[PDB]
Structures are given as C-alpha cells and as structure tokens.
C-alpha cells in the first residue's frame, strides 16, 4: 500500500462534509454567514472589525450568483427564491 493510495483511500472514505463544490451550496453557506453576521451587528452597533468581513462575503456572493445566472438561469432563480434573496 503506497502512501498516495493510503491517503487517497483515507479521504475518499471518511464520511462527512467539506463538499461545498456546488454553486448553490456556496451561495447558501455565504448567505447563512451574511445573515448571522448581520443579526450580530444588529445588537453590536459599535463594531468596526466585522464590517470589512461582511463586505467581502457580500461581494463573493454577488460573484457566485452572477456565475450561476449566466450558466443556468433556472438554477439561478431557484436558489435565489429558496434563500429569499
């Protein structure tokens, strides 16, 4: 058993997440973080550090959304509808 094959079998057969290779899942994970961070700033108006981070996530989501819109309008509107965007 080579290390390569041993390490490949390891990840290949470890049951769980880390998938997120889907446009919809990436858009949803971001939305969840953007929603959580906004509910956080809601009660922490004095914050300054979390502002930059939120802007980056919003931008990265616009990009992902723009990608899906061009690739497949059906999948684009289905996800926008499900996340309430």
Curated annotation (Swiss-Prot):
SMART domains registered for this protein in UniProt: Ribosomal_S15
Name assigned to this protein: Small ribosomal subunit protein uS15
Complexes and interactors: Part of the 30S ribosomal subunit. Forms a bridge to the 50S subunit in the 70S ribosome, contacting the 23S rRNA.
Keywords assigned: Ribonucleoprotein, Ribosomal protein, RNA-binding, rRNA-binding
Molecular function, one GO term: structural constituent of ribosome
InterPro entries in the cross-refs: Ribosomal_uS15 (IPR000589), Ribosomal_uS15_bac-type (IPR005290), uS15_NS1_RNA-bd_sf (IPR009068)
GO cellular component terms given for this protein: cytosolic small ribosomal subunit
Protein family: Belongs to the universal ribosomal protein uS15 family.
Functional note: One of the primary rRNA binding proteins, it binds directly to 16S rRNA where it helps nucleate assembly of the platform of the 30S subunit by binding and bridging several RNA helices of the 16S rRNA. Forms an intersubunit bridge (bridge B4) with the 23S rRNA of the 50S subunit in the ribosome.
Ribosomal protein in keyword set: yes
Keyword Nucleotidyltransferase (UniProt): no
HAMAP family: Ribosomal_uS15_B (MF_01343_B)
Alphabetized Pfam families for the sequence: Ribosomal_S15
GO BP: translation
């Amino acid at each position: 058993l080579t290390q390569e094959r041993k390490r490949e079998i390891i990840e290949q057969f470890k049951v769980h997440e880390n998938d997120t290779g889907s446009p919809e899942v990436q858009i949803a994970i971001l939305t969840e973080q953007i929603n959580n961070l906004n509910e956080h700033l809601r009660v922490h108006k004095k914050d300054h550090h979390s502002r930059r981070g939120l802007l980056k996530m919003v931008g990265k989501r616009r990009r992902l959304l723009a990608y899906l819109r061009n690739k497949d309008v059906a999948r684009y509107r289905e996800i926008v509808e499900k996340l309430g965007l």
